Every structure is written in C-alpha cells, then in structure tokens.
Amino acid sequence: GSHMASKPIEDYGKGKGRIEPMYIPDNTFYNADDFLVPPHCKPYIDKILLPGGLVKDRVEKLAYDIHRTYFGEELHIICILKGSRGFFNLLIDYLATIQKYSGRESSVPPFFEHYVRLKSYQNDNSTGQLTVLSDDLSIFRDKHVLIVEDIVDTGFTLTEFGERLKAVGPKSMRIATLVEKRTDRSNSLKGDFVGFSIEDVWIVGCCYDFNEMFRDFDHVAVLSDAARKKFEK
Amino acid sequence: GSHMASKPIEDYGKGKGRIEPMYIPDNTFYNADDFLVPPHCKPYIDKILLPGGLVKDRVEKLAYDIHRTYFGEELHIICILKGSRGFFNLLIDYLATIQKYSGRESSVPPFFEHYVRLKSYQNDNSTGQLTVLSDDLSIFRDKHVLIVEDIVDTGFTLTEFGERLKAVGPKSMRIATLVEKRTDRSNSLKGDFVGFSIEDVWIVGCCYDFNEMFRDFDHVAVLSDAARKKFEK
Amino acid sequence: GSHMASKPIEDYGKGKGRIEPMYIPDNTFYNADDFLVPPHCKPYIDKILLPGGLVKDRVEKLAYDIHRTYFGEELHIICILKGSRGFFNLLIDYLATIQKYSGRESSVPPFFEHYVRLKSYQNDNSTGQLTVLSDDLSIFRDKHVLIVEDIVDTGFTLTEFGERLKAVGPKSMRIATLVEKRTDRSNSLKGDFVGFSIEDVWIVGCCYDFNEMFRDFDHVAVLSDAARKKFEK
Amino acid sequence: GSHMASKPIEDYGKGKGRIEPMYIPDNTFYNADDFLVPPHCKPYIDKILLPGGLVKDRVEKLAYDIHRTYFGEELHIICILKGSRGFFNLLIDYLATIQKYSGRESSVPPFFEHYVRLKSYQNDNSTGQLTVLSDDLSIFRDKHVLIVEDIVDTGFTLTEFGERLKAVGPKSMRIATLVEKRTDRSNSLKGDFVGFSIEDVWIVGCCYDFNEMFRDFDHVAVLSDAARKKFEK
Numbered sequence A, B, C, D: 001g002s003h004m005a006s007k008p009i010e011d012y013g014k015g016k017g018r019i020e021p022m023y024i025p026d027n028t029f030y031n032a033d034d035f036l037v038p039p040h041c042k043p044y045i046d047k048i049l050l051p052g053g054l055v056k057d058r059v060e061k062l063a064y065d066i067h068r069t070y071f072g073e074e075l076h077i078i079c080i081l082k083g084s085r086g087f088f089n090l091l092i093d094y095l096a097t098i099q100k101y102s103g104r105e106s107s108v109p110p111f112f113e114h115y116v117r118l119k120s121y122q123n124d125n126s127t128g129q130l131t132v133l134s135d136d137l138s139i140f141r142d143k144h145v146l147i148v149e150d151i152v153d154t155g156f157t158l159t160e161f162g163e164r165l166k167a168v169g170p171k172s173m174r175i176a177t178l179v180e181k182r183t184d185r186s187n188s189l190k191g192d193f194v195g196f197s198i199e200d201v202w203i204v205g206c207c208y209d210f211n212e213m214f215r216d217f218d219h220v221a222v223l224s225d226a227a228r229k230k231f232e233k
Ligand SMILES: O=P(O)(O)OC[C@H]1O[C@H](OP(=O)(O)OP(=O)(O)O)[C@H](O)[C@@H]1O
Pocket: A080, A081, A082, A083, A084, A118, A119, A120, A121, A149, A150, A151, A152, A153, A154, A155, A156, A157, A158, A209
C-alpha cells in the first residue's frame, strides 16, 4: 500500500487533485458521412462528437492514470449499468494488460469487479427518482472503491448513489467517468478520472442511449430531431 | 419476422435442434508455461483448458449462428452477472459487427441488452439458494429472449431463473452458454448455442472465478490444489 | 464486380468519381498530453493531428468503399513499403472481415497481397531519385490493381511508380492513401480512396517516419523542432 | 540490453539456449465446422491445426521473450515477405505495447522495421533457387538483427539468406519463426523464438499459402486433397 491511493471520503465527487479532461470546444463535430453507419442508425445520425476510436485512445490514458494511483492496491471497481458497460469493458482490458506487461510486479489482481444498476432518465429528462439495484454494499467497508460511469451531467445519479456507499464506510471513493457535461444543471459533483468535457448536448451512441436506442452504434453522436421524433415516448 | 426465431416455451433448456458444441476430450490441456501468465496468477495456474484466443474464435461462430437465427428480429439479450461479462462483451461486439457488414439490411438493432445478477456458489459448492437481482421482468412479455451465460454445470441457476422468466410470458427463450460441463450432477438443462463441452473439472480464468479470484486471467484453466488452498473460505 | 471495378487507365491519379476524404481544417490539433505517449517519444510529440483510433475508424469506411468496388472480382493490392505497412494491415483485416460477414457468395478471396518498396525521402526532402524494389510486375497484366499508400504529398512517388505499372498493361489502377496533403508542392496526383485531407505540415507517428524514427508511435503527430534537431541527418 | 542481446554469429540457426516451443503432437486437429469459414474457403478447409486466436496468444509470449532479450538496445527486425506479414504485424504490435506499458525508461524504440522478400516454393515443392529482394544489407553492420519468419521447414530459405546477412558483419543474428516443422527434410536450422512445433503436414491459412491461395483465412489448416486439386499448377 501507498498513500497515493488514499483519499478522504469528504473529497468524494469534488475532483480534488485531478488531471483535467480533454476539452471538446463548443460546436466541434465530425460528419457522420465520413464513417460507416449501419442501416438502423443511418436515418438518425448526422454529427459525431467522439469517434469510437478516439474514445478508445483516451481510455488508454485514463487506464494508465488509474494504474498509477492504485498499483499494488486491492481495488474494487463498480460498473454502473447499463450505460457504463462499454467504457468499463475497455478500462478493465487496459488495466489488466498494463499490469501484465509492467516490469514492477504485484501479487494483487489489477481489480475486483462489481455491478450496480442505477436508473434516472426517461427520454432526456430525469424522473426525479433513482432506481438502485446492487449486491449488499457492506462488502465495500474499508475498501478502495472506484465507481465507473459513462457520463456525469446533473450529478444526481452519483450524488445519490455516493451517499449509499458512504454509509458502509469505504476506505476511499473515486469516480472515473468517460464524459462530463458543461451545464448549469450540474450540482458540481465531478469525476476524478474524466475522459472528455463536452458542451450541453444530448449524446447517443457508444452505450449512450435514448430510451434504450443507439447503444450499439460505434461512435458518440448528438441526438438529432429525427431520432427524438422516432424514439421518444 | 421469420419463423426461424420461434421456439416453444416448453422447449426452454432442452437444446432441441441445436448445433452440438466443440467437444474437448477428457484430459486435454495446454501447458501454462507456453503462455504469458501475470505474477498474481503464476503460482496457481498449471493447465490451460481453453486458450483465450480459442474462446474468441469459437464465439465468432456462435455469434454467426445467433445472427442467422434472429436476423431482423427484436432480440432481448440478458447478461447473467458476474460470470458472463466477458463472453457477453465478445458476443455483442460480433453481433453488431456482423450486422454492420451484412449485405442484407435490417432497420432493427442487432440486440437490446439487459443485465440480471444471479448467485449460487461459494468455493466450488452451491449454497442451495439462488440470489436474483433484476429490473422488473415484465418487460420481457412477448419478447424473443436470449440468456447469455458463461457455464452450465448442474443447471440449477438457469432452471430456477428460467421459471421466473416463463412467468412473464416471453415469446421465445433460448440459452447461449460458452461452456457446458459433462457431469452426473446436471439436471439435463442444456443450452441452444454452446461453445464447448468439457469434462468434470472446476475451471478458473476468463471470468470463471473461485471466490472472486482469477476473473482477469486471459485463459480458461483448471483450479489447482495451490489455488484452492490459497483462496478457499 | 466488373461493372464497378472497371476504370480507364488514363484516369489513374485523377481521383475521378471519388468520395471526398474527411477534411481536417488548418490548425486543428489535439494535445499530446491527453494521450499515453511512450518514453522514447515523450520529448518529441506535442501536437496530435490524427488519433490512432480515428485512423482505424476511417479505414473501416475506406475498406467498405473498396469492398463495394471489387467484390466478386480478383483484386491485387500492393503495399508500398515501408510507410504503408500499418494502413495496409488495417485495410486488409477490414476487407477480409467485411467479405466474411457480408453473407454474399463469392469463390474469390477479398484480395491478393503484393509488396513493392519505394524510397524518395531523406529528412523531409526528396532526393530526387526513386528507389524501386519489386517482384516482376508482369504478373499485374490484365489485373485490377489497387496501390496502398500512407501519404500522397508531392505526388512524385506514385507518378513514377504509376508509369512502371502502366507499362505492363493492368486492367485497372486505383490508389488508396490514408492521407493527402494540401500543398502547392503537389503535381495534382490524387487518390481514389483517401482517408484524410490535411494542411501542409510534416507528420510523424503511426508509420509516418523521420529518418526511420517514430513509426511505432500510435498517433499521427506533427514533427516538432526538438524532433527535427535530434533526428535530422 | 547488451548482456542479454549478445550472441555469437556462429550460433545462428542452432536455437542455442532457446525456450522450447509449444509442442503439438501428431494427429492433433480441431474440426473446421466449429469455426466460421468464409465461402471461398469452405470447400477446402477441413482440419484446423492452430486456431488463429491460439496463434495470437502464443505470439504474446514470444513477444515478451523478445522484449526480455533486447530491451534498451537497438533491435533491427526483418520481415520475410510474403509469408511472415501476419506474424510480423502481431509481433510488432505486442513489442510496442509491452515496452509502452513496462514502466521502464528507454529512449530506444522497441524495434526498427525492415523488409526482405524471399521466394522458394511452387506448389509444395522448392524450385531449388532462392529469390532475394532487399535494400542494401550493409545497413545491418554492427546491428542486433532478428529475422521474422512464418515457418521453417527444410531450412533452405533461412540458411541461404543467413549467409548473405553474415557477410555484412551484424552484431548478433536470431530467428523468430511462428512454426517449425518436424521433418526428415530439415537441414537442422532452427529458430530462437519459436511458436509451435508441428508434424510433417503442409499448412495453409493465416498467411500460409498454396500458390498464393488461403492467406486471408483466419486459422492454420491442413492442405486438403480438394485444395491441392483446385489450386495446384
Ligand atoms: O448525472 P446525471 O444527470 O444523473 O446523468 C447521468 C446518468 O444517467 C444515465 O443513466 P440512465 O439513468 O439513463 O440509465 P442507463 O445507464 O441504463 O442508460 C447515465 O448513464 C448516467 O448513469
């Protein structure tokens, strides 16, 4: 163990000491027509915010940042379902590979995986209620916990779930989020390992859904008017 | 829709009309020393049953078999956590890629993903009780459902969970399991899309755990005496 | 197929009827500090023009465009060494996967590979003399030929080699190039399947070298002053 | 590093001090029907010797063995075209990733790539004459050289090319070969980094060709009678 892994519980969600994310300036997009877009997505995707390959490149760096923080530590990593599935899978592949090739050796696994299903949204609006599905959280007492999320927008999801975790007394709590949105709807909760800062637009693709649609598309796009009209409920 | 996707609910778990899996004969192993084994696994892994790359090659074929069964269908695919995470992630990458490259076009996504956490084992013994954590299963009424699992051994997990699903009235129910074990402990439930048939040995690695250990190792190995002694509880 | 693959030899280098590439506007760069940069490159890489994953995403679309041109027909694809190694390898992986998953019958392989080593540059200047190392080019008589290149800049390399190939009487000749540079140094030769249009800057990384340095870096960067000073000859 | 990389030139082809390869016993084959086989290969492929994913898993370990030999030292790696393309590309990807994640400082790249085209075979018989296409080999004077090959069978190709390289005075010469065949036709030349030892059968697939056919198939198979009849010349 190293003091590098420590973090006060009161610092949860404050982003203290973080490396700032890649900042995608307002109105910065690629054209969907430059990518292969499958037939079920073609009528609906016009603007690409984050190419899928750019996501993977950035997650490599996040994974190294995490590796450096937790080397040799027992690390309990929590996937927030459904949305973080893709980011989590990329992350844990990199974490395992980095450790496998590291000259410095650890007798501890690179992580221990866990799953929690949270749900807030219908269309692009929160219901105001958080659904929480988890194993008994008491297993996280005195553990170093890393929550893995796809996006932080208002902060409601991770503020609420964070209080449930604090109640069992973890040793440390950090957040990895692929995206953080720039919005006056945010309650100021922010991640520790953040891929990208983006403008206030509703993203779809690469696990980002609109009523369960678009998760399998390879790229992070914006929700178009055609997509909203077809898939809203 | 095609009648190819239909299957009577009473045929659930009977493997009727299936393509038989690759049969790994008794006492067929590779040597761990021919692979790169990370330090946290090195004292514990001696025999490799399924190289990680062999798993990936076989999942390609399973994915095509599934694609052919469900082309153009609304397909609700359920990941059984924790163990099926790796197989599920490989599978859905192939399903999406196959559909993206297919000359024949579908306006339906290749799948709709879902997660259910089931738990039966402690060490290598069932507790006799099944833990079930899920969203409301009523969403599967009148749906084509494909359950994705890492292994079927006794059949207890999928027999019990299968009855919960039958109660909401799905349209069809199939099972994809990477491995099926040859054992007189089986209740005869078997999968529809099965990767490998293996002898009666306790496997670890490639998401197969022993008390949460070995999931990140790249290859499917057997549980050694050293591993049991170190990690049993 | 022949209706799609046919093209007059005199159209070689005109990019006649092409799909225009992704256009990267002047002065558009990512910051190296947002990516993982290995120690041998760290002192030298500051500006990232094309993330390696964006390269891969674009190559998928090029490969689809090429599949649509040649499916069902013998395709003889020529890798221009050394620089095109990485693009060629990505391209042929996609071509094979696309045809494999297309669901369309063909007894013809997705490509037949060939290799030619061409050399023009020392530092960032042409010597004026093209080195040509090849098997007997007579094997391309009456064949559909696709030349695969990493970059077209002045056009010298592919104008000179193009003339040697015309002399053996191919059925068609096209160019795939990952990058085309916007430069007044160009003789107006341009590709048929082009990944990216970029400003007049000397790129390194992702197989783009400066005196054999930087090929293994994952991303396409600009040649910095430090890099020039250290590695010029 | 020099203590590890040094080796007498006279030990070339002896495999002196090597790690023995994975041993595939006589008559050990998987069934093609358990894999996805593309339409152009379906009539011809029946027995799978080495699944493509098993190839990849073994190459990771070879790459680690090579990293341990050359880290910190200039390594000049020579791809023998055409056959070694796929092995070479896997190997250099691993070498770069290993060094990148090692956490060890080095200003030296993981390798410097080079290409030589050698040709001996027509059908499954040598013509007796070796075609050699290369840049000036004088650039290897006083360098650590690693030759990368897909298979060593009779030893003719690498015995003849080995003599040309000795004439320019390299610092060291080693061989990486994915496969070595057990055959009384061998002149006893053997590799230093060898993936697999196999019985005396003619392999195709995974870059192994018969008159330029089968390179793009993903798996290493045996040449069937149907394949021989259709593609022999
Ligand atoms: O910061 P917030 O404003 O709370 O929003 C972010 C959260 O909302 C989304 O989940 P959603 O509720 O859509 O469930 P899903 O992950 O299953 O899509 C997203 O995946 C985050 O979990």
